[PDB]
Design an enzyme around this catalytic site. Sequence first.
Site, PDB file in Angstrom:
ATOM      1  N   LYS A  33      31.963  34.257  37.522  1.00 39.64           N
ATOM      2  CA  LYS A  33      33.346  33.971  37.851  1.00 39.64           C
ATOM      3  C   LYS A  33      33.636  32.463  37.781  1.00 39.64           C
ATOM      4  O   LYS A  33      32.712  31.640  37.693  1.00 39.64           O
ATOM      5  CB  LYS A  33      33.661  34.553  39.228  1.00 39.64           C
ATOM      6  CG  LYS A  33      33.600  36.043  39.276  1.00 39.64           C
ATOM      7  CD  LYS A  33      33.823  36.446  40.713  1.00 39.64           C
ATOM      8  CE  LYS A  33      33.811  37.918  40.839  1.00 39.64           C
ATOM      9  NZ  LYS A  33      34.164  38.381  42.205  1.00 39.64           N
ATOM     10  N   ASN A  61      32.747  34.638  45.359  1.00 44.19           N
ATOM     11  CA  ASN A  61      31.425  35.211  45.381  1.00 44.19           C
ATOM     12  C   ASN A  61      30.659  35.164  44.083  1.00 44.19           C
ATOM     13  O   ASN A  61      29.902  36.058  43.772  1.00 44.19           O
ATOM     14  CB  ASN A  61      31.424  36.606  46.040  1.00 44.19           C
ATOM     15  CG  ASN A  61      32.232  37.622  45.294  1.00 44.19           C
ATOM     16  OD1 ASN A  61      32.812  37.342  44.262  1.00 44.19           O
ATOM     17  ND2 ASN A  61      32.302  38.820  45.843  1.00 44.19           N
ATOM     18  N   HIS A 101      30.472  38.874  39.143  1.00 41.28           N
ATOM     19  CA  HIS A 101      30.911  40.267  39.134  1.00 41.28           C
ATOM     20  C   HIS A 101      29.840  41.042  38.410  1.00 41.28           C
ATOM     21  O   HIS A 101      29.256  40.533  37.437  1.00 41.28           O
ATOM     22  CB  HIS A 101      32.224  40.458  38.342  1.00 41.28           C
ATOM     23  CG  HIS A 101      32.418  41.862  37.820  1.00 41.28           C
ATOM     24  ND1 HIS A 101      32.853  42.896  38.615  1.00 41.28           N
ATOM     25  CD2 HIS A 101      32.165  42.414  36.607  1.00 41.28           C
ATOM     26  CE1 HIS A 101      32.849  44.022  37.929  1.00 41.28           C
ATOM     27  NE2 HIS A 101      32.432  43.755  36.708  1.00 41.28           N
TER      28      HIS A 101
HETATM   29  N1  LIG Z   1      38.843  42.073  51.807  1.00 42.71           N
HETATM   30  C1  LIG Z   1      38.610  41.243  50.771  1.00 42.71           C
HETATM   31  N2  LIG Z   1      39.078  39.998  50.901  1.00 42.71           N
HETATM   32  C2  LIG Z   1      39.177  39.224  49.839  1.00 42.71           C
HETATM   33  N3  LIG Z   1      38.858  39.469  48.568  1.00 42.71           N
HETATM   34  C3  LIG Z   1      38.133  40.651  48.456  1.00 42.71           C
HETATM   35  C4  LIG Z   1      37.983  41.571  49.489  1.00 42.71           C
HETATM   36  N4  LIG Z   1      37.161  42.652  49.034  1.00 42.71           N
HETATM   37  C5  LIG Z   1      37.087  42.496  47.750  1.00 42.71           C
HETATM   38  N5  LIG Z   1      37.451  41.216  47.366  1.00 42.71           N
HETATM   39  C6  LIG Z   1      37.149  40.599  46.087  1.00 42.71           C
HETATM   40  O1  LIG Z   1      37.304  41.525  45.015  1.00 42.71           O
HETATM   41  C7  LIG Z   1      36.225  41.671  44.015  1.00 42.71           C
HETATM   42  C8  LIG Z   1      36.138  43.160  43.602  1.00 42.71           C
HETATM   43  O2  LIG Z   1      35.851  43.809  44.863  1.00 42.71           O
HETATM   44  P1  LIG Z   1      34.796  45.007  45.078  1.00 42.71           P
HETATM   45  O3  LIG Z   1      34.746  45.712  43.811  1.00 42.71           O
HETATM   46  O4  LIG Z   1      35.125  45.693  46.303  1.00 42.71           O
HETATM   47  O5  LIG Z   1      33.384  44.297  45.295  1.00 42.71           O
HETATM   48  P2  LIG Z   1      32.189  43.908  44.256  1.00 42.71           P
HETATM   49  O6  LIG Z   1      32.708  42.741  43.629  1.00 42.71           O
HETATM   50  O7  LIG Z   1      31.016  43.641  45.134  1.00 42.71           O
HETATM   51  O8  LIG Z   1      32.048  45.079  43.333  1.00 42.71           O
HETATM   52  C9  LIG Z   1      35.064  41.216  44.969  1.00 42.71           C
HETATM   53  O9  LIG Z   1      33.979  40.677  44.264  1.00 42.71           O
HETATM   54  C10 LIG Z   1      35.685  40.132  45.859  1.00 42.71           C
HETATM   55  O10 LIG Z   1      35.763  38.810  45.206  1.00 42.71           O
HETATM   56 MG   LIG Z   2      33.561  46.152  41.795  1.00 41.98          MG
END
Ligand SMILES: Nc1ncnc2c1ncn2[C@@H]1O[C@H](COP(=O)(O)OP(=O)(O)O)[C@@H](O)[C@H]1O
Ligand SMILES: [Mg+2]
Lengths: 150, 150, 150, 150, 150, 150
Positions: free
Chosen positions: D11, D114, D117
């Site tokens: 990212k 974070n 992805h």
């Molecule tokens: N409650 C939240 N607050 C802020 N941003 C969020 C939240 N949950 C998800 N995100 C963001 O959205 C991206 C896509 O979310 P998700 O698919 O749930 O997690 P992952 O990225 O671990 O697959 C995440 O990597 C994160 O940056």
């Molecule tokens: Mg995801």
Amino acid sequence: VNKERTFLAVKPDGVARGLVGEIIARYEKKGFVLVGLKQLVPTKDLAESHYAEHKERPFFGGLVSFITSGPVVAMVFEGKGVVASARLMIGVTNPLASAPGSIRGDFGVDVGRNIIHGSDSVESANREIALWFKPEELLTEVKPNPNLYE
Amino acid sequence: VNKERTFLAVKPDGVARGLVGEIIARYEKKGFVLVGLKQLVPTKDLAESHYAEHKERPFFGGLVSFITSGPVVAMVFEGKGVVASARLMIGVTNPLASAPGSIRGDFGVDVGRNIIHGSDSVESANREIALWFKPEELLTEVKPNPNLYE
Amino acid sequence: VNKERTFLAVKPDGVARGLVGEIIARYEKKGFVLVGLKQLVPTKDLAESHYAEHKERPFFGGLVSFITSGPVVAMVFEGKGVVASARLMIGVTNPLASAPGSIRGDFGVDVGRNIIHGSDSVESANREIALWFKPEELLTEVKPNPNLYE
Amino acid sequence: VNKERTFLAVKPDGVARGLVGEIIARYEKKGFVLVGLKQLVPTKDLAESHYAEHKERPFFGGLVSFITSGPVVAMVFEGKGVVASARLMIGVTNPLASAPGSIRGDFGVDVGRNIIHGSDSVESANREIALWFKPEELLTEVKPNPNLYE
Amino acid sequence: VNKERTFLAVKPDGVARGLVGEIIARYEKKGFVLVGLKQLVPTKDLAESHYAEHKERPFFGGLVSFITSGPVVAMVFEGKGVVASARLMIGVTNPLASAPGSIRGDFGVDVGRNIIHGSDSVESANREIALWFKPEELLTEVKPNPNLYE
Amino acid sequence: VNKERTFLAVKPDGVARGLVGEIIARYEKKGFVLVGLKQLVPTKDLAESHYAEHKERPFFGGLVSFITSGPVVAMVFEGKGVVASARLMIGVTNPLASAPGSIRGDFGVDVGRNIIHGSDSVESANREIALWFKPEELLTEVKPNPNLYE
Ligand SMILES: Nc1ncnc2c1ncn2[C@@H]1O[C@H](COP(=O)(O)OP(=O)(O)O)[C@@H](O)[C@H]1O
Ligand SMILES: [Mg+2]
Ligand SMILES: Nc1ncnc2c1ncn2[C@@H]1O[C@H](COP(=O)(O)OP(=O)(O)O)[C@@H](O)[C@H]1O
Ligand SMILES: Nc1ncnc2c1ncn2[C@@H]1O[C@H](COP(=O)(O)OP(=O)(O)O)[C@@H](O)[C@H]1O
Ligand SMILES: Nc1ncnc2c1ncn2[C@@H]1O[C@H](COP(=O)(O)OP(=O)(O)O)[C@@H](O)[C@H]1O
Ligand SMILES: Nc1ncnc2c1ncn2[C@@H]1O[C@H](COP(=O)(O)OP(=O)(O)O)[C@@H](O)[C@H]1O
Ligand SMILES: Nc1ncnc2c1ncn2[C@@H]1O[C@H](COP(=O)(O)OP(=O)(O)O)[C@@H](O)[C@H]1O
Ligand SMILES: [Mg+2]
Ligand SMILES: [Mg+2]
Ligand SMILES: [Mg+2]
Ligand SMILES: [Mg+2]
Ligand SMILES: [Mg+2]
């Protein structure tokens, strides 16, 4: 100025040995900014014009043969004095003569399997960047770490 | 003997770029002992005294301004030939001209943002150590790994 | 706001084995900001208040004698959820049970020689920070990497 | 079988922090083969269809906003069980809860910054790979380290 | 006490992939002492005795065939709880299911090419140590860093 | 052909400081192949023949007593120009004068505690290899990474 650019390519041997990330990290840690990046298997035409200055040399055939034998990760880094600096970081043509700390010195052993290519001058870099990358694959506005330049 | 000491300082750029531990670990692995360590935001008087030899140079104003713009981690290492060895590990003034493997060579690009300061001689080290550290902030009993010295 | 702080101390064994830099680097890579840092030889008074909750335990006597037996590098990191996070990075009390990737898991074998201390709660952190550091020894302007927080 | 593929993207925050090479090296060392790689600044349309499953979620706007704010390095890795493995190597959504040793655990501090992805299932991976890469940008014949598979 | 020993072996894949030093360094950093070390191409008898408990399993033929296809570096480490700690550092049988930070987790992808073998219990360690090492090939006097144990 | 061999020995100080793995890894990354490896405590007879060219020197007595004072890990690497290359990687006799990036430059401070020994010529290597290793202890089938040589 902080806008000079150089062309670097992890050669097939570097890619097959799992050295792409290690090489990119050295340049990132140094502070250079990645403005172009892609993996492709070079075409015999790309390889010949890329190494055009060596066309009349004995090793030319094997070089073009080698460079086209597998994927290459091509990249362009931007920064102050990046052309000469990236060369210093690469080492010399023969990895055996390259000092430890440099890329060829740390990972290479043979002149024909020397892991990475780097532009040797700004003219070559401009020429080589134009050769491997389309203008839309290059970042236009670069914003480095603000703690890098005075 | 092995009681020579040097003053090293991670400049504000090195601190902001998160290079403090990397720098400290390089000297610990070499076998040098940390006898003083602190983080402080240098004052303009300290900055100017530390770099007093450059007060007539065109870059002094900007140097002093930069060295005081943020935290610096000041430290003193002890060991045989530490003053000259630490300079060798740092590189040269211009990071672009520093060899890969040295601190400035590996991490910097601009003379003005060269990450770390190291005393250039024993006389300088004594001066700089007295300038940045109070006596009680320095270890009086030093114990280097017993496999380091004959 | 994400200005939470935790107190961490590289214990005498950690300092003697040359792990100060390696330990600091793990917290710097994570994005936490060093707001206080110093090396000192703990006083019995300090070691005893530090480990106050353990006076009735059989190891207290040994614990105090050890922490006051040599240099300790003390530091305070600041960042979102730093207290619990730094604990996760440290591992658990018994280094042999600490998972590979944590500090104790990677470097320690014995409970009494477990390299590093970290506050276990914000309450303990505020208390420990005020124990080891005077207010003017801690940074007031904290500028973390702008790419770290939303 | 050794032909599964997953989509990973460093990212904007990961790219600005100089973590591209460190991330790619973890996957190379693990034995996965890079079959696709490029840097691009995502388009608002790419971002929305990429994160389409979250379109009705509160954080959707900021996410799409963020992902489109700077360059992203997109990649596709090939190997046995690479989708679930790359996730394990990434950590969990909140980097604070991610274990040391994982990418988010080692470098992250905020859910919205974070670093990387990763596709969460083979369906998503196939869908996401098709979204970011043209068939000609992907290696057709992959040849891993022969010492990797029985 | 801290005289427990374990037998570890870098399998032919780990040797061919150039992971011997990486593996050894992980155990040295932990604080374990090397009391035996050699490189040899296992014989079919050794391979079959070493893996005798699996002689009825469908994969035995292929295991024995692989373990004898090339050099292996056999070694024995000593220290407190070394048998269980070394297993934790290795990971689990299937590398894909091993946590990042462990050896198999960081470097392997196939159960059949899982890089390293570690004794699963003290009884097994004694059996395997006697099987691969002659008495005189093992250090009788062991000296671990003095900062490792209380 | 590129089957040249050199003998290297991690000295007792190198072994005591936990640098065996780190040292082996540098030669593995370079592409050289380990063809012999063992840990032993040198005998006075062996140490004296090893350092035979130095008997008339004032340090000979100390040198021999030190090399026979603890474990030494002995090894032979094979590869194109390994002798001269391994020397370049080691540094020079005085670790303080060894450049950062070399083994002695990175880890040593004293001439008598200089971590590692490397043959200085092919003549010395053949001689030293036959001194420390029996013929059947050395690999006969050498299979180096196929990406290393042309
Ligand atoms: N409650 C939240 N607050 C802020 N941003 C969020 C939240 N949950 C998800 N995100 C963001 O959205 C991206 C896509 O979310 P998700 O698919 O749930 O997690 P992952 O990225 O671990 O697959 C995440 O990597 C994160 O940056
Ligand atoms: Mg995801
Ligand atoms: N005599 C040689 N033998 C074999 N191949 C060679 C020889 N010299 C050059 N090459 C190969 O050709 C590439 C282009 O060569 P050159 O431009 O001279 O060096 P560099 O790559 O260091 O700029 C080199 O990286 C190397 O792989
Ligand atoms: N010509 C220059 N332009 C700008 N800043 C300079 C220049 N020369 C030196 N500096 C800054 O001054 C600091 C002090 O200079 P000097 O003592 O010559 O070098 P060093 O820091 O290598 O000992 C340098 O480290 C750099 O930050
Ligand atoms: N059973 C014990 N024996 C020896 N030392 C111990 C024991 N339990 C705890 N300690 C020592 O006391 C220190 C402080 O204890 P505690 O707060 O329980 O652990 P932690 O350091 O993980 O927070 C430990 O870190 C360790 O150095
Ligand atoms: N089902 C399997 N398929 C193929 N090989 C297997 C399988 N299970 C185990 N192996 C091989 O057998 C070696 C010995 O197995 P085992 O003792 O169960 O595991 P470990 O090696 O983790 O102690 C494994 O490390 C792996 O190389
Ligand atoms: N002046 C000296 N004082 C102490 N030890 C020395 C001295 N010169 C050489 N040595 C020791 O003798 C070892 C062998 O010497 P030499 O062959 O000259 O160096 P190298 O090890 O670099 O080949 C050195 O590596 C070092 O351990
Ligand atoms: Mg060229
Ligand atoms: Mg100076
Ligand atoms: Mg506690
Ligand atoms: Mg088993
Ligand atoms: Mg010699």
